[PDB]
Amino acid sequence: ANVDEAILKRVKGWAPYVDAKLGFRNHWYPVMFSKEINEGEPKTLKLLGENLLVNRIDGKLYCLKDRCLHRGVQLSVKVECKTKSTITCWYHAWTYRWEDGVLCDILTNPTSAQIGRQKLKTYPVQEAKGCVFIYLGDGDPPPLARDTPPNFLDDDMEILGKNQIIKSNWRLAVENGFDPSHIYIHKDSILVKDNDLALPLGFAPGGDRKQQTRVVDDDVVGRKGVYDLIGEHGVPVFEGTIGGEVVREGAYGEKIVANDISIWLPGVLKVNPFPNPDMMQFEWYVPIDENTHYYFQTLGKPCANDEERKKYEQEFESKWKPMALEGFNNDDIWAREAMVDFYADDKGWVNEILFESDEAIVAWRKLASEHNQGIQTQAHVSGLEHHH
Amino acid sequence: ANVDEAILKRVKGWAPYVDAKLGFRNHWYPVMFSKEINEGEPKTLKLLGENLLVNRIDGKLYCLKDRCLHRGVQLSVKVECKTKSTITCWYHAWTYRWEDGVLCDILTNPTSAQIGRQKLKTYPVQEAKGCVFIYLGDGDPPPLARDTPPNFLDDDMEILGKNQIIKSNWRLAVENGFDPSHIYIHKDSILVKDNDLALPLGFAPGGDRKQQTRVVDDDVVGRKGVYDLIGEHGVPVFEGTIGGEVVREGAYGEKIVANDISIWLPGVLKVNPFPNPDMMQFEWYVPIDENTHYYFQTLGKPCANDEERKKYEQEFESKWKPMALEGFNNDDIWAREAMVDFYADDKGWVNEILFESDEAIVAWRKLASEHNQGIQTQAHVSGLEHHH
Amino acid sequence: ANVDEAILKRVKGWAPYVDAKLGFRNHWYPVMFSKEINEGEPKTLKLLGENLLVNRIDGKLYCLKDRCLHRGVQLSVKVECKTKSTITCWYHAWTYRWEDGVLCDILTNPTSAQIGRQKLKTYPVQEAKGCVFIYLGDGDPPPLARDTPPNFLDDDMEILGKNQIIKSNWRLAVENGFDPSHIYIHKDSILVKDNDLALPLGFAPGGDRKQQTRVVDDDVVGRKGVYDLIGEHGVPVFEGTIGGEVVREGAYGEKIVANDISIWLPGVLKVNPFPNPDMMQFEWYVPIDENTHYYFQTLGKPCANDEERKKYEQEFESKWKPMALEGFNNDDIWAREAMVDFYADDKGWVNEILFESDEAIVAWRKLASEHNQGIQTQAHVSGLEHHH
């Protein structure tokens, strides 16, 4: 659908994933934090190539396609919300209900036969853990838990985070995050020295192929994901040699992190514990268009009361955000960016030469291929085909 | 020719118009004002995708294709007019006559067998009402009147105006201008308050389909156009309601404007009277390339002598230009711009959902389809095919 | 391979040359000066569309493809040379030898089965006359002399020069340089007045077609090129006339230059003597990508000892560089640039109308077509096709 059939033919193992340049339809995705959207102040964003509007009305979020049915302009060019329940296109005043997208009035012609007989696409929106999720899909949504990693929605789990737009395809981001050997790029992170981390350079794998991961399709809430098990039969590498000469060493700090690493559909990584033994990291790589994603980073820590919550928050702002989310993950950003050119023409998928630790990535590509809930296409983006 | 055959098949009603992305060949178009081009000071512009040079020689305008026959460079990169009758290419000094485009000399080789045996394309140029029109077409031109709205060329009609380059396809501009319901976007114009205009929000149409317009193919000078008659059987809308609640009102001033609205091939709108009961507006949307047009705005007022002419001019500069041509029509510019994305892939033509007041636009699309004098193509732009 | 088959069919005379948009593979090309690359300080450049790294190790130059075999990132994003013999990719620490490109270690997994079993492409590099040449080709290189003009590699010949990136295809540059009538564009050069040059406006050719050039395929070092002989039977033009009227004259200085003009594969011009009777100019137009070339300019003067060498150098810096390489050849840069649009869609090759002095260019197009050592293609650039 999105990629040259000749390339798709050559990746048998994982063709749906190679075709899913625009992401997977019929999943939940986080797009902003709750606190970024106030009552009666609509926001625009692009998700899976679709321009969307989000509004908060009597405290509740609603999401409309930001494209008028009439002449295809963005309503957001000049927002006119003239009743709490509605938005009016600035051009010829077609008026839509936030609740169901129905065209309920046309100010320029209240006799129009179109009234009541057209409807703008809406998507479900839910807030959880101070995060706004959109179900970019058709029909009744699944529970959010299906599309979130374990423990993210636990009652006591306190989530704080950061979001930004990054110029790479979302798959380059997923793969970088779940890539065991990419830990090499983090060897000089301020986080490593300043938080006294143990951090190898890499891994000498052991065991068989199947032992390198746990593929999860037996989670009772219907989550689908892969655990990275390279360290169970594998040996961490702390000394990097060239021709037998040690030229680089790993980090020999005390704090043990990243015991459990798992990637989940639609594209969220959970690293536990990280960046400190008492907290976890959940990060999403949300498709905006073929070239760009939201890097939606969260750190979670179980907190028992408002006191714990407020100090977590203060540590987050003074330490974990600059030192970890920025000081550790900034290198991930430019690593993703550096793979853009090779994958741009869809040929990186066939001309890459993988090595042993990439078994984790292969397992993900296969899981995503088999268990995604739909391939987003340009027809989804450009819409229904009329023959008037 | 310009658009995917599959799309053209789906717009039966008006396929030539959908194909005419680059505009209609074999019409007159205004491109600048007379006062902008002085004796012996050639100017460059692009019209229907073609790079042109215009010069004034003994008071008269001439137009040459700005592309040397030899290696295809623009002569205008470095203009060398070394005799009044000629221009010399800066590269190998092929020299062309302004009057007929004939290659009359080559300074670098006066023995060349090419001399007298090659000719650059020329186009007819006429000045009228202080406006420079180019006939972008082949063969002997029609009278200018054929391609101008009624009354524009009347003896007493004094024309003043403004020109600029706007980033939309020319058809988006035509349609916006001739769109009865688009009056909604003008509801907050400074012109409306400050010139005490009556201006509805829209129209409740009445009568039959055919009564909504007058299609003109019986004009004796051969003009072809459409009058917008929505107000003859229709009722203006001054109260905009949502769920029966009045949320916006029109403008209840005294001055009645825009009694007669007509669109004419090749793409010129006449609104009478406007922006004041004693004057009219004529505006062209001239194709530059597929993405851009000249928005060539003129206001006309019958003046009996130099006294009337000079005060018209002073009102124009102090009032009508800032208040009307800018303060009213600026909103039209960004409205055009907002339709670009939907129409960019040629699919807006099939995926738009039209309503009743768009009958005027449909009538234009059909008139333009039937009565245009040719479809400009990329072959016109890139030129004659040689097999040397 | 690179151009629409329908266009290639129409240039029978010279189709390989029209197809060679990215240049000719299996030739030597100069890319920088020796003094620009220091011991242990690798540099990045693009040549024939390929991203390359060059390093100096124990005084000797080596060239590796700047694209990791693993995930296709540029090694140069963050260079890690951790042993003199090697470079380590910043991402997962695949480590390559400069000498043969072999993957000799992987810091992230020293047990990997890939080690010793993969190799990055290398290219031969030679320095001569203070210029760095890369053999962008496969297999054992020819002698450099094959791909350089006569006398460039003479022992006593002292070469100084300048390099920059110019935004045109390399062929537009070659043709401009070897175009006899293009001398017109140089008629106002500061060099002409300030160095008292004789410089005609052009040439009235005489003799037959074959007499206009000498095609060289009998050089014993295997050079292939064309001498421009237009002045042997032709008469220089010093008076430019339009309708018989003299409107421009040539330059009637004393110093006679450019007696011998020759173009050589892969695309180097030699003008002798120039810009002074006692020196010569050699200039390369090196393909970077389809849109851009290095304009690699050198001036050569036989020098007998260090005294002559040092004064040559001082004249070069104070006079010949600003006055000739800049003051004369700057006009060549913008002339090349002005042909870009006509040749951009590959149609200039068929829609150009050539005249008599272009016989030199035709002879080159045919020589290049017949004697080039390979057509660079996008498959060369994007690489070997794997079916893992």
Ligand SMILES: Oc1cccc(-c2ccccc2)c1O
């Ligand atoms: O995307 C990510 C975010 C945060 C931590 C890691 C990590 C993985 C392995 C070892 C150390 C850190 C990661 O991959």
Ligand SMILES: Oc1cccc(-c2ccccc2)c1O
């Ligand atoms: O393009 C245009 C230029 C000037 C005036 C109008 C107009 C049309 C209807 C009602 C009021 C003004 C317009 O369409």
Ligand SMILES: Oc1cccc(-c2ccccc2)c1O
């Ligand atoms: O590329 C070039 C570089 C330097 C000199 C010339 C030249 C050619 C003919 C006559 C005069 C100068 C040239 O073509």
Ligand code: FES
């Ligand atoms: S484009 Fe929105 S009402 Fe017309």
Ligand code: FES
């Ligand atoms: S390109 Fe104009 S004379 Fe050669």
Ligand code: FES
């Ligand atoms: S991309 Fe270079 S080692 Fe992985």
Ligand SMILES: [Fe+2]
């Ligand atoms: Fe990372």
Ligand SMILES: [Fe+2]
């Ligand atoms: Fe308007």
Ligand SMILES: [Fe+2]
């Ligand atoms: Fe030159």
